[PDB]
Design a protein around this ligand. Structure first.
Ligand SMILES: Nc1ncnc2c1ncn2[C@@H]1O[C@H](COP(=O)(O)OP(=O)(O)O)[C@@H](O)[C@H]1O
Ligand SMILES: [Mg+2]
Lengths: 369, 705
């Protein structure tokens, strides 16, 4: 029973090998107080982590140490590691092999130093970082297809056929989950509300969590909700106010399907995944279209499966069956697959024991994965 | 002839064929032939040092020495044994000529090392000190009735009176309000009762007055679920003598009430069902009018009877209204005072100003705390007033001024799931050891001064001060609870967070345990000499919060004679910690103004088989009692009390010869060539007044050959 702990920027999720459900999951916020201490004897904590920190955002500043699949400001991410191991999952790492997760190709130096930091101080027995998509694949029991996890920090595609991780068509994209929230900030300024600070900026992803459904034929649905007041929806902040969101409701997620709104000049996800399809052989396209699997988070938006099916079948020749696999086990499929992989006995020989690292130097992760 | 760290006891006699590499081959006394680790293998003291009545003359002074010597001496059915200043007894239970009339007037001199080990001797030497220095003396009884002691000073006091029976008569009654069954070693009187017997300048007994010290005031409420409350509560419980219950309006069911229901109330080993007759009879024949006699029952019942009180949270507001008028009214009648004004004084206490307007304010939580505080205080003060009455029926009018006092204190406590109570009791128990260490250091200081060469490390008390500061010294530990109850929103976890912030690493005695196998998880640990302690601080903030509400106190005057009498005689919100610290300082002051001596008790086993040792227990008590700590003091230091002539006599194996018993290199001819025989370190011994102390241990090997 080793361990499995996701790295992804949004929600550091911790659990045990084999178990079908992460034992503890919490947002990866790291907080610091932004005001002087006034009631002597508080015994203030000098930093806060996770849902404890999220509890009292009122006097807190929020640093996400994980942006775009790059681990920045390593001090706080180490703090998150430390809080995870001891408080959430509650075992010393000294007696548990550990496995982490990592986006396709983020930088070179990232793993090459992260293995060191988590392998020298925490003094873990053994570790092996596994690229996200191949892990997502096992999680669903399909050993052939294209993965689109789009974990909040980064979105990417891989072609995987008959269990081969065909590298060169890996098509990464930085259309992250958080940036939908950030754009929603700018679109919500227009209806007259304002969300300047950081705490409210955290709230808005929550308000995004429920009220963002992507709709087919964006033009017609847009003019539809413009003409009729049918879908005018309401919601309340933990303030007392109630906020009325109009067509922003379905103008949020469509930044995914076209980035012209956010500005980035890189085609929407459907065109990228079709691209990565068309950058393989003329025989692998027979099956690839059939096993398309969503994964990660940021795809729990209702409808996105169907809209995706429409766009692809329009793009691909209308002689293939594009039936896409979108189980509702999403947002965790990363972790399920990770646990299953840690459960494979043949997998035991793979990862790196302390001896190899000590006698070989840090590069062992890249050299042996 | 060596010692082996065997699994069960780790301090038993061994037999080495040899030892090699790290793994000793040896045939053990505990079992069969085995192999064992070297480092903890210890060495047997020579026959001339071996089997000495004092545990201060055994070269390898280590713990195995005092262990096996006790095991053998009690195996030979000896009971009296000397261990440094401490005296050790086991008091077997099948009759032996132990209280023989020959010794009773016998040991009239022989200060401490001139007669066979015997404590009547040292008590009589205290009598002699009284004759000479005319100054008070103090008996230091370790261990409680749970340690099988009760039958020792009951005889020792008569012994001292020989050179009267009213003293015991208090015991049967005062036990009922003071004996409390615990998790381990049940049926222990947890209250301290210093007992002094007064002598005038003459020496004929004039009187003996008794004052209790540091009663466990928090036992009344929030007892541990596993344990049980004071014996008196279940005495009153049993239907036997139901007429007193008829006076007391109790329903005769333990689990009805809040305070009792925490207890187990079903202890098949010992219940006061028979004892209620004896306690009532003593409580009568000790000179009690029937009015005070049944009034005592009235107050004891009412202390239970509050447990039925129930309060509700007021609408759109904060203070508490009273619920359950009928039980409040039964209580009110029971103490006579009106119910309406009592509940009102609960819901709106008075706090003075430069002129005392009827100020007001409370909250439900505060009320539930405060009423319990009031109950605890009234019970404790009731108990002390009964002590006053016991003085009253024993009053004297002779000129009594010089007393030799026996004090009984709770023993050192280390067992499972120890909350605040254990911390308090352990601190109290160890302060007396601080007193002992300083005292023996003073005497040995002047003695070695007469032989003055150089002292190792003054003030043996530092060894304990290192943890005394941690427990008490401002912003230590005990102070943190005082501060934490005051601070708003008392939460249990924040307490430990503050402790870890403030005294981890900063204090070299405050650390954390790990995976205590089956006993529930303690939070923080301390390294005492006697044993590393482990506590979980759940409920501490509740335990020590106790606001002594005034308005009810002033309301109490217009009722039965007892309660006004009790509470008429006698502020930063006193909480058990502060009261406790102050009272302990009072006690140590009273011992500061006296002189000590030490009497201990040893339990053989739970099976109660007299005459035979059982190692699992005795090792724990000996380690806990601190006799091993005194042996530690002697071992690391000079204190090995040796005649210089004794050393010159015993050392002839290195002065090539065989014949002992004098007639070789004597006192005046040594420390010249002797250590040069086998090249022993210099200046570990000299003759100043021909009395020499030692760094002993080097003197075991040299006489085996
Ligand atoms: N109700 C919801 N509907 C849609 N998306 C959501 C909802 N709740 C959270 N999310 C998104 O899921 C993201 C988490 O995905 P990510 O962190 O990339 O994967 P992982 O948590 O496995 O690392 C969050 O950033 C958030 O934007
Ligand atoms: Mg995440």
């Amino acid at each position: 029973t080793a361990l499995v702990c996701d790295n992804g920027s949004g929600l550091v999720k911790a659990g045990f090998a084999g178990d079908d459900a992460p034992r503890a999951v919490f947002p990866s916020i790291v907080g610091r107080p932004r005001h002087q201490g006034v009631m002597v004897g508080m015994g203030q904590k000098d930093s806060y982590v996770g849902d404890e920190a999220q509890s009292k955002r009122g006097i807190l500043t929020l640093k996400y140490p994980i942006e775009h699949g790059i681990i920045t400001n390593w001090d706080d991410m180490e703090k998150i590691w430390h809080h995870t191991f001891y408080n959430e999952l509650r075992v010393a790492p000294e007696e548990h092999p550990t496995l982490l997760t990592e986006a396709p190709l983020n930088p070179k130096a990232n793993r090459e130093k992260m293995t060191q930091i988590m392998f020298e101080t925490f003094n873990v027995p053994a570790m092996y970082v596994a690229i996200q998509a191949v892990l997502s694949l096992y999680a669903s029991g399909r050993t052939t297809g294209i993965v689109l996890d789009s974990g909040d920090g980064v979105t990417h595609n891989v072609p995987i056929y008959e269990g081969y991780a065909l590298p060169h068509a890996i098509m990464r994209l930085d259309l992250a989950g958080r940036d939908l929230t950030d754009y929603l900030m700018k679109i919500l300024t227009e209806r007259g509300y304002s969300f300047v600070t950081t705490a409210e900026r955290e709230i808005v992803r929550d308000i995004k969590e429920k009220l963002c459904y992507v709709a087919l034929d964006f033009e017609n649905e847009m003019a539809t909700a413009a003409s009729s007041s049918s879908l005018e929806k309401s919601y309340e902040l933990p303030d007392g106010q109630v906020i009325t969101i109009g067509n922003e409701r379905f103008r949020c997620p469509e930044t995914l399907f076209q980035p012209s709104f956010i500005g980035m000049e890189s085609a929407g996800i459907h065109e990228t995944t079709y691209n990565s399809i068309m950058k393989c052989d003329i025989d692998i396209r027979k099956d690839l279209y059939a096993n398309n699997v969503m994964s990660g988070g940021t795809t729990m938006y209702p409808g996105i499966a169907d809209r995706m099916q429409k766009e692809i079948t329009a793009l691909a020749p209308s002689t293939m069956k594009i039936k896409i696999i979108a189980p509702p086990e999403r947002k965790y499929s990363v972790w399920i697959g990770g646990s299953i992989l840690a459960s494979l006995s043949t997998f035991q020989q793979m990862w790196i024991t302390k001896q190899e690292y000590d006698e070989a130097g840090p590069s062992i992760v890249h050299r042996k994965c | 002839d060596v010692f082996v760290p065997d699994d069960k006891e780790e301090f038993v006699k061994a037999t080495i064929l040899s030892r090699e590499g790290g793994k000793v081959t040896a045939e053990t006394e505990h079992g069969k032939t085995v192999t064992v680790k070297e480092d903890q293998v210890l060495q047997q003291n020579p026959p001339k040092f071996d089997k000495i009545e004092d545990m201060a003359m055994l070269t390898f002074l280590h713990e195995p020495a005092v262990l096996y010597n006790l095991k053998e001496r009690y195996a030979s059915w000896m009971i009296y044994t000397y261990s440094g200043l401490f005296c050790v007894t086991i008091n077997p239970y099948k009759w032996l000529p132990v209280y023989n009339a020959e010794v009773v007037a016998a040991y009239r001199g022989k200060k401490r090392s001139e007669a066979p080990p015997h404590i009547f001797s040292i008590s009589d030497n205290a009598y002699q000190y009284m004759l000479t220095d005319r100054e008070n003396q103090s008996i230091l009884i370790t261990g409680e009735s749970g340690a099988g002691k009760t039958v020792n000073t009951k005889r020792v006091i008569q012994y001292f009176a020989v050179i009267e029976d009213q003293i015991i008569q208090a015991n049967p009654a005062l036990e009922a309000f003071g004996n409390a069954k615990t998790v381990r070693n049940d049926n222990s009187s947890r209250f301290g009762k210093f007992i002094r017997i007064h002598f005038g300048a003459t020496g004929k007994l004039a009187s003996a007055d008794i004052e209790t010290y540091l009663l466990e005031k928090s036992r009344v409420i929030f007892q541990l679920k596993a344990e049980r409350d004071y014996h008196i509560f279940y005495q009153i419980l049993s239907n036997k003598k139901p007429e007193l219950l008829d006076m007391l309006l109790i329903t005769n069911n333990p689990y009805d009430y809040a305070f009792i229901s925490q207890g187990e109330t079903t202890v098949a080993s010992i219940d006061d069902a028979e004892e209620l007759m004896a306690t009532d009879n003593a409580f009568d024949v000790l000179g009690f009018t029937t009015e005070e006699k049944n009034s005592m029952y009235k107050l004891t019942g009412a202390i239970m009877h509050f447990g039925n009180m129930k309060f509700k949270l007021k609408q759109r507001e904060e203070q508490a209204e009273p619920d359950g008028t009928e039980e409040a009214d039964k209580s009110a009648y029971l103490m006579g005072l009106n119910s309406a004004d009592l509940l009102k004084g609960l819901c709106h206490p008075r706090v003075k100003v430069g002129n005392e307007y009827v100020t007001k304010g409370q909250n439900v939580q505060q009320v539930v705390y405060a009423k319990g505080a009031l109950a605890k205080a009234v019970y404790e003060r009731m108990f002390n007033w009964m002590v006053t009455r016991i003085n009253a029926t024993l009053e004297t009018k002779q000129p009594r001024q010089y007393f030799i006092g026996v004090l009984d204190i709770a023993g050192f406590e280390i067992f499972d799931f120890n909350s605040f109570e254990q911390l308090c009791i352990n601190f109290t128990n160890e302060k007396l050891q601080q007193f002992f260490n300083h005292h023996m250091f003073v005497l040995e200081q002047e003695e070695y001064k007469k032989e003055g060469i150089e002292w190792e490390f003054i003030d043996f008390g530092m060894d304990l001060q290192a943890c005394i500061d941690l427990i008490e010294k401002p912003m230590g530990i005990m102070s943190i609870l005082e501060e934490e109850c005051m601070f708003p929103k008392a939460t249990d976890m924040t307490f430990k967070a503050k402790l870890f912030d403030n005294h981890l690493g900063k204090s070299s005695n405050f650390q954390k345990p790990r995976n205590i196998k089956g006993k529930p998880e303690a939070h923080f640990s301390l390294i005492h000499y006697a044993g590393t302690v482990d506590y979980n601080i759940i409920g501490w903030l509740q335990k020590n919060k106790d606001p002594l509400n005034e308005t009810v106190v002033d309301l109490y005057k217009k009722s039965s004679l007892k309660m006004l009498s009790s509470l008429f005689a006698n502020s930063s919100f006193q909480t058990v910690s502060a009261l406790h610290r102050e009272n302990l300082n009072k006690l140590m002051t009273n011992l500061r103004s006296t002189h000590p001596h030490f009497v201990r008790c040893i339990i053989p086993n739970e099976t109660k088989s007299p005459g035979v040792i059982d190692n699992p227990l005795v090792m724990h008590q000996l380690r806990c009692n601190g006799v091993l700590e005194g042996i530690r003091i002697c071992r690391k230091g000079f204190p090995n009390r040796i005649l210089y002539g004794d050393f010159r006599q015993r050392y002839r194996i290195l002065n090539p010869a065989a014949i002992p018993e004098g007639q070789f290199i004597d006192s005046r001819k040594g420390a010249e060539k002797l250590l040069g025989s086998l090249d022993i370190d210099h200046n570990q011994y000299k003759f100043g007044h021909t009395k020499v102390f030692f760094k002993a241990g080097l003197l075991g090997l040299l006489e085996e050959m």
